[PDB]
Scaffold this active site. Structure first.
Site, short mmCIF file in Angstrom:
data_model
loop_
_atom_site.label_atom_id
_atom_site.label_comp_id
_atom_site.label_asym_id
_atom_site.label_seq_id
_atom_site.Cartn_x
_atom_site.Cartn_y
_atom_site.Cartn_z
N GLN A 171 14.10 -26.99 7.73
CA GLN A 171 15.00 -26.46 6.74
C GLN A 171 14.93 -27.39 5.56
OE1 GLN A 171 19.58 -24.90 6.15
NE2 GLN A 171 18.95 -25.34 8.20
N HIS A 175 13.24 -26.60 1.70
CA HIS A 175 14.12 -26.45 0.57
C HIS A 175 13.81 -27.34 -0.63
CE1 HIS A 175 16.96 -23.50 2.24
NE2 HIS A 175 15.95 -23.58 3.04
N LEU A 352 7.82 -15.56 4.47
CA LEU A 352 7.34 -16.01 5.75
C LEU A 352 8.07 -17.22 6.29
CD1 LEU A 352 3.57 -16.35 6.28
CD2 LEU A 352 4.94 -18.39 6.40
N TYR A 353 8.55 -18.10 5.43
CA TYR A 353 9.26 -19.25 5.94
C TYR A 353 10.70 -18.89 6.09
CZ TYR A 353 7.27 -23.87 6.72
OH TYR A 353 6.65 -24.98 7.24
N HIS A 356 14.88 -18.05 10.19
CA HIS A 356 16.24 -18.22 10.67
C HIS A 356 16.47 -18.00 12.16
CE1 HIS A 356 16.71 -17.89 6.34
NE2 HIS A 356 17.75 -18.66 6.54
N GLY A 494 0.45 -17.97 7.41
CA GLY A 494 1.24 -19.12 7.04
C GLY A 494 0.39 -20.33 6.90
N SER A 498 0.40 -23.32 3.89
CA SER A 498 0.86 -24.63 4.22
C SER A 498 -0.14 -25.76 4.01
CB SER A 498 1.33 -24.66 5.65
OG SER A 498 2.68 -25.12 5.67
C1 HEM Z 1 16.12 -22.93 10.98
C2 HEM Z 1 16.26 -23.47 9.64
C3 HEM Z 1 16.24 -22.67 8.51
C4 HEM Z 1 15.15 -22.37 7.78
C5 HEM Z 1 13.70 -22.78 8.07
C6 HEM Z 1 15.65 -21.61 6.66
C7 HEM Z 1 14.85 -21.17 5.63
C8 HEM Z 1 15.30 -20.55 4.50
C9 HEM Z 1 14.47 -20.30 3.34
C10 HEM Z 1 12.99 -20.54 3.18
C11 HEM Z 1 15.26 -19.79 2.39
C12 HEM Z 1 14.82 -19.45 0.96
C13 HEM Z 1 15.30 -20.40 -0.16
C14 HEM Z 1 15.12 -19.91 -1.61
O1 HEM Z 1 14.02 -19.50 -1.99
O2 HEM Z 1 16.05 -19.95 -2.40
C15 HEM Z 1 16.59 -19.66 3.00
C16 HEM Z 1 17.69 -19.06 2.43
C17 HEM Z 1 18.95 -18.98 2.99
N1 HEM Z 1 19.28 -19.48 4.23
FE1 HEM Z 1 18.18 -20.45 5.46
N2 HEM Z 1 17.03 -21.44 6.72
C18 HEM Z 1 17.40 -22.09 7.86
C19 HEM Z 1 18.67 -22.19 8.33
C20 HEM Z 1 19.77 -21.66 7.72
C21 HEM Z 1 21.14 -21.73 8.26
C22 HEM Z 1 21.71 -22.48 9.45
C23 HEM Z 1 21.86 -20.97 7.44
C24 HEM Z 1 23.22 -20.75 7.59
C25 HEM Z 1 24.18 -21.46 6.79
C26 HEM Z 1 20.99 -20.43 6.43
C27 HEM Z 1 21.39 -19.61 5.40
C28 HEM Z 1 20.61 -19.19 4.35
C29 HEM Z 1 21.13 -18.53 3.16
C30 HEM Z 1 22.57 -18.11 2.89
C31 HEM Z 1 20.10 -18.42 2.30
C32 HEM Z 1 20.21 -18.04 0.83
C33 HEM Z 1 20.63 -16.60 0.48
C34 HEM Z 1 19.61 -15.46 0.65
O3 HEM Z 1 18.41 -15.69 0.90
O4 HEM Z 1 20.05 -14.31 0.49
N3 HEM Z 1 19.71 -20.87 6.58
N4 HEM Z 1 16.62 -20.18 4.28
#
Ligand code: HEM
Ligand code: HEM
Lengths: 554, 554
Positions: A171, A175, A352-353, A356, A494, A498
């Protein structure tokens, strides 16, 4: 009408629309010839016909560990490693090609670096189906596909034995280059620099980087809570930070990536890397009493980038590939190759990344489970348990299976819904088009895709054609490899995105990967032997279990 | 004190200052070894010992035109051309290394692209002399060196027979990548994009590029005066433009590079290239009725960049090299090389292109000489004579000798004075250090430098040591080659900076140099056959004498 809606040009030739009714495929050096770029040169041919199945190559990398202990002990480690690098990296274009605004090469697409290249152009906005030609006239309701197929029914742990230390590393790491603009829209990265610029630690913009710096010994600002070194408060470094309205400056920690207030997960790691920065500053100060702040700072950013990119190749990617080949980060494998050292993170790579499914049902630190509503935004947990404890905890709890489907816990299921809708705004091409593109063969049925009959059948009922399966759904719903965290497409699509981002980092260039860049052997050896255990344990008062792997096999 | 003041590390090894009193040379892959990077590997050795004298190679390129007509008729043209490209390009680092703020590699130097790389670091601000070790305690008064040695006494025309069409092409061209910030200081380019982004036609910032665009058929805005197409007024495109206070919007022409109001010279050319843009738009419109404005615009910028970079290699550089080798722009010569496709224009390259000696004593258009006080800022001259006439005029008047000294006409002599002072702020290293660096051997005396005794002697009296001759003075005061416009150093130091900027343009990459980029064969052939005569004559109602060469030899 509009020939390019039929995706006519094979082997990534490019469909230029000509006078009104007609078009042309540009097969310049695709290896194929003729009007749809399909007749193979004899070399092109022979190569492709002899290329072994992906699914098979996978098994060789998970065939007898004895043979691989021997191969890992010889120079063949290095040969195969070079070859993985070259081969996989060649699939990503350099310089960048397209972006949401342009499905042609343009200088703008080449220079407006708030953009995200896509490697395959949009489904032309004048096609019959929203997916080109084939498919239902209007796509499946995102909300629905996610609840019906993506949503976690019963938790499936990842078989490879990945833990949350990995889940959260991934994560954090991700980011620093995925930062969709929001205020400009999809397309548009705020993380200009487009790769492992450590802007999640230091800032996407200089002004903030100066706000987080101490400006003494090359160091970064911090605060001291209980015994340890924790990030400064927004009180001591204005910087910004996204925190739920009503949380106060003092209780907020100032970090680099503004989002990391969201979870301990994100914060834990940012603490380790701040501590690591300071440490390196002091070794460097000790070495060069002349140096002064700016040079200590900058030389430290270089060491830590070197560290991050080693740990990712030799430990993170080695954990989720599960290959018995011992991967190595040796930039020198590419000094004989024709490699370009630049990267532009692609929008598809962002989809792809989106993995969640790793996030679990609850977070067991110590012997107490925490709910998502206790975990997310919990400001004290980090300070309360301290880096040592949380590392151990996250190192033991297993992360979920990514691939296979039906595993996104409901608390975050909405995100996958937004992803599918962004695929749609983005007008990303079909899945399979991307399959072809990444050197794979298209699925003939959903049944081939999934590997069962019930979901496949409903999926068919929904999409209308296998050739109309959206990129992200297909990625997540494809059958996992044997007993792996995801299946074929995640690795074949992927992996090149990467490895180019990693080895296309200026540091890996012959021009930079010299000992002086890092401040002499001292610095240079710190990147050359970096290890997750070293990262955590040299910055903690006591070493916990630290791994990307769940223990012992328990 | 401070070892690196002695410039200890030879063959571009890098002097990292270690604990207080000591230092270390990093000879990583320099070809040499040992503590000051001086013991040659046997290969390194053999190569260097067999390398023929530069002064000699020059004569071979100006030895019997018969043999060169034959070599130009075979593939050896291409071999030598490839080889010029590789060999010369290897001398410029990629990715970039340093900048005024950093005499070490840093990520910042790598990403803050408002900066100008320098290829050799600053004279450390703690050295005894302002030039390191050797030299007078305080440098010659700039004002004085320029009046005494740089200033035009009697006009010396260039022997190669360069004319003002060339003088002004060079001015125009150069001003798309040299745009020192002023408001930020030395270092700092406002011409981010760092090369042949045609921002002198289209703008250094998008917002202005939109201001100059018509947004119809991919076209650029314009106005129609008498019969012809001339740039729009600041009335029709706000844009900015530097014009002497009190000149009115209407009478100002809006162009791309804000300075070009300054002379007809600059304006003449910007008119030709605007007309050329429009033309190309229409051919492209004719080809692809589907296209729409943005794609016509962007595809036109690509054709014109392709044109500019062809004309520069095959005609501009062929005029001032004076080689009988027929140079060619074929990007494909580099597809087998290890070449990086990116450029960062260096501050030293900016000093070296300060070649104002080309400007004459007066400007004879038609049969009437104009003074500088009639030429500079003359708003009507262009419109009054029209592109056709001025091209002919400038094509016939000879430009001055660059090298040799005593040739900067007084009206612009002040500029050379500011250059020397910027060398000083910039803390540019000695000249000779740069000599060594560019594979040449240092001068042992001013007498060797100049090639006479009077100036050399006073120069010696002023600088104190030949090893303390400032970079720009030395460049301009060195002895011209045989009967050439400049001498050895201008070619050996200038040539690599120039060929990397040209061939390191993304367009030349295998990824981009495909016919589709340009919009099919039509577009692609326009860059492949671009010629100065074609550029001018296809956009003028009648073809004048158009050349970089002064006629007939008259
Ligand atoms: C297993 C780890 C996780 C990975 C690898 C991951 C990966 C990602 C990636 C790549 C993005 C895109 C960022 C961007 O381009 O702005 C994202 C967005 C997001 N992630 Fe995660 N995430 C993880 C865990 C979480 C967790 C625990 C939450 C819960 C709080 C979460 C909530 C979100 C939200 C709310 C978005 C932004 C809103 C949206 O895309 O509509 N993520 N995440
Ligand atoms: C023979 C053609 C010429 C060439 C190749 C040439 C080249 C240059 C270059 C490379 C710069 C640096 C731009 C920057 O980094 O900002 C410059 C600056 C300058 N040139 Fe020229 N120039 C030419 C003719 C002229 C003429 C005719 C004038 C007289 C109006 C002139 C006046 C100046 C001035 C005032 C500056 C900016 C101020 C300064 O450097 O202190 N140049 N020129």
């Amino acid at each position: 009408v509009n020939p390019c809606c039929y995706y006519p040009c094979q082997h990534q030739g490019i469909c230029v629309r000509f006078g009104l009714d007609r078009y042309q495929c540009d097969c310049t050096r695709t290896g194929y010839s003729g009007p749809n770029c399909t007749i193979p040169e004899i070399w092109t041919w022979l190569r492709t016909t002899l290329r072994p199945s992906p699914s098979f190559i996978h098994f060789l990398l998970t065939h007898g560990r004895w043979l691989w202990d021997f191969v890992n002990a010889t120079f063949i480690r290095d040969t195969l490693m070079r070859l993985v690098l070259t081969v996989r990296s060649n699939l990503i274009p350099s310089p960048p090609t397209y972006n949401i605004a342009h499905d042609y090469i343009s200088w703008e697409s080449f220079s407006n670096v708030s953009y995200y290249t896509r490697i395959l152009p949009s489904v032309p906005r004048d096609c019959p189906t929203p997916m080109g030609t084939k498919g239902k006239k209007q796509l499946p309701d995102a909300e629905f596909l996610s609840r019906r197929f993506l949503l976690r029914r019963k938790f499936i742990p990842d078989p490879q034995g990945t833990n949350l230390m990995f889940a959260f590393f991934a994560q954090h790491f991700t980011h620093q280059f995925f930062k969709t603009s929001g205020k400009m829209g999809p397309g548009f990265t705020k993380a200009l620099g487009h790769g492992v610029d450590l802007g999640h630690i230091y800032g996407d913009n200089l002004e903030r980087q100066y706000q987080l710096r101490l400006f003494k010994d090359g160091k970064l600002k911090y605060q001291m809570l209980n015994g340890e070194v924790y990030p400064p408060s927004v009180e001591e470094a204005p910087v910004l930070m996204h925190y739920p309205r009503g949380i106060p400056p003092q209780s907020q920690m100032a970090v680099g990536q503004e989002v990391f207030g969201l979870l301990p997960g994100l914060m834990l790691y940012a603490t380790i890397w701040l501590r690591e920065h300071q440490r390196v500053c002091d070794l460097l100060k000790a070495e060069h009493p002349t140096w002064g702040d700016e040079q200590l700072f900058q030389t430290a950013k270089l060491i830590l980038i070197g560290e991050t990119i080693k740990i990712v190749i030799e430990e993170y990617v080695q954990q989720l590939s599960g290959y018995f080949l011992q991967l190595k980060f040796d930039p020198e494998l590419l000094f004989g190759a024709q490699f370009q050292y630049r990267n532009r993170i692609a929008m598809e790579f962002n989809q792809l990344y989106h993995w969640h499914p790793l996030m679990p049902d609850s977070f067991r630190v110590g012997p107490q489970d925490y709910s998502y509503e206790q975990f997310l935004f919990n400001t004290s947990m980090l300070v309360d348990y301290g880096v040592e404890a949380l590392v151990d905890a996250f190192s033991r709890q297993p992360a979920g299976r990514i691939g296979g489907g039906r595993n996104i816990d409901h608390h975050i299921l909405h995100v996958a819904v937004d992803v599918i809708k962004e695929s749609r705004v983005l007008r990303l091409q079909p899945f399979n088009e991307y399959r072809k593109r990444f050197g794979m063969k298209p699925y003939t049925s959903f049944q081939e895709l999934t590997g069962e009959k019930e979901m496949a059948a409903e999926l068919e009922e929904l999409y209308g054609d296998i050739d109309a399966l959206e990129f992200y759904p297909g990625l997540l719903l494809e059958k996992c490899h044997p007993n792996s965290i995801f299946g074929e497409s995640m690795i074949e699509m992927g992996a090149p995105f990467s490895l180019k981002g990693l080895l296309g980092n200026p540091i890996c260039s012959p021009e930079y990967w010299k000992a002086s860049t890092f401040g002499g052997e001292v610095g240079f050896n710190l990147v050359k032997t970096a290890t997750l255990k070293k990262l955590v344990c040299l910055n903690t008062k006591t070493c916990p279990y630290v791994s990307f792997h769940v223990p012992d096999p328990r």
